Amino acid sequence: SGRENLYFQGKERRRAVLELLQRPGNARCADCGAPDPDWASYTLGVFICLSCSGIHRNIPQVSKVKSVRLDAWEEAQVEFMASHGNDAARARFESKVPSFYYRPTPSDCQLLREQWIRAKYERQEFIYPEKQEPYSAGYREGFLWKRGRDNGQFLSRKFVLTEREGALKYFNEPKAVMKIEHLNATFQPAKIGHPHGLQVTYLKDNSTRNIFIYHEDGKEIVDWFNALRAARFHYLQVAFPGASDADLVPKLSRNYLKEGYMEKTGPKQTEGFRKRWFTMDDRRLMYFKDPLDAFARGEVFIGSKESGYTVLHGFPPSTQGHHWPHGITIVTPDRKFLFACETESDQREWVAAFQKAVDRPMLPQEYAVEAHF
Ligand SMILES: [Zn+2]
């Protein structure tokens, strides 16, 4: 007779709420992919993580959120979640997401995660694809705040990204014409000192230039970032014909595997140790006196073990003059580099980044790159 009573009725209601999290399609946050989302937008019908729920809470005309475990649910609300959910959302709100569009993860800055949510649910850019034209048309112009090479100041400059000319250019007759093949971009809000800060890099003469820009409008800077990825995508299809689209997407733009301060010495190993900001981009290791420098003090190619590159914990017994005690030795065919890290946790992370590069076979295109150093 237990089935006939009000306690059973309630237990079934409670089980129905929790059951929605045990469907495979709802195993990860709809927006950033974090595992085991505990929150739901009951107007959009998605299951999202605590962090994403806060972003949603901030578009209250579109999304209302509450906890699947801790808040009360009306029957109709549970039935709404059950008829929607994360797979449904993917088919609706991610119906027409361009292959080049950057999909954020929990590690990404607030700007990326917020604008992903706004593009999907607020602006509905992937439901109504004409809204994608600002960054999908192969031409984009606009003004951005650009840091001076050496002067610390941000000034308004017109940028033009033109796939037809194969370049990003800007004017201060352009001041610079930067070929797409040599461009990368990564959001760096903490380094730049602005939440919408984007770092754009350009390789010429085997020397990387850092350009540091922002826009007051978060949508506009993220649209520049994705426009640059679109341009990169079209360039790569041309340089690598018969590479699949999926093959190309990881190459469109590259976040840095690691950055941070280390001390280094010179080619003799006796010169004295100097603090530098290091950035590891794929196989290119760049070191700067300051992170916002336009140019590196030096750049090192980290090739594969098949070409005689290796990485070791520690320093040789000879070594003197350093004061951070956690050493890393990089052996290249031409030079032994000695870097010192302030902590063991950082040493471990640096060795792991260098080891990943050494352990991976070189790609065809990387042989000519190596040749330039
Ligand atoms: Zn999330």
Side-chain angles (χ1 to χ4, degrees), residues 103-129 131-152 154-172 174-203 206-244:
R103 284 160 188 272
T105 67
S107 57
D108 285 316
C109 66
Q110 208 274 346
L111 175 60
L112 278 169
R113 287 182 277 106
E114 179 180 345
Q115 290 292 328
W116 174 235
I117 287 164
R118 291 180 178 270
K120 283 195 303 181
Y121 308 118
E122 179 182 34
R123 307 196 285 264
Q124 303 186 306
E125 299 190 359
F126 316 117
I127 293 173
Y128 306 106
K131 288 195 158 189
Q132 300 166 21
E133 289 297 325
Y135 55 82
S136 301
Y139 183 90
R140 188 169 164 82
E141 61 180 33
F143 284 79
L144 289 163
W145 294 100
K146 179 195 159 287
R147 201 179 181 82
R149 180 176 170 171
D150 299 313
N151 71 12
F154 289 82
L155 300 177
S156 161
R157 301 286 175 250
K158 185 171 201 173
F159 280 75
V160 179
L161 171 60
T162 163
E163 291 183 11
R164 165 192 311 267
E165 302 195 337
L168 177 72
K169 47 192 190 180
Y170 64 97
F171 303 81
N172 76 337
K175 174 64 165 90
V177 175
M178 299 174 285
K179 303 182 164 216
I180 293 161
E181 63 197 280
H182 297 317
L183 280 173
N184 188 44
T186 62
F187 276 92
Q188 296 294 151
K191 175 193 299 188
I192 296 167
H194 189 283
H196 299 171
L198 180 69
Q199 183 174 349
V200 175
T201 66
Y202 175 56
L203 180 73
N206 209 45
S207 160
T208 304
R209 177 60 194 270
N210 290 326
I211 297 299
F212 300 101
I213 46 172
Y214 69 83
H215 199 287
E216 299 282 23
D217 190 333
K219 177 193 158 47
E220 295 305 313
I221 198 70
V222 172
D223 282 4
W224 277 106
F225 176 63
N226 286 298
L228 291 163
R229 291 174 55 84
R232 289 275 306 160
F233 180 58
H234 292 143
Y235 154 73
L236 286 159
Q237 282 179 317
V238 174
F240 296 112
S244 80

Side-chain angles (χ1 to χ4, degrees), residues 28-34 37 47-53 106 113 117:
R28 306 185 161 272
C29 172
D31 303 333
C32 73
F47 293 94
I48 55 186
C49 72
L50 176 53
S51 177
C52 291
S53 77
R113 287 182 277 106
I117 287 164

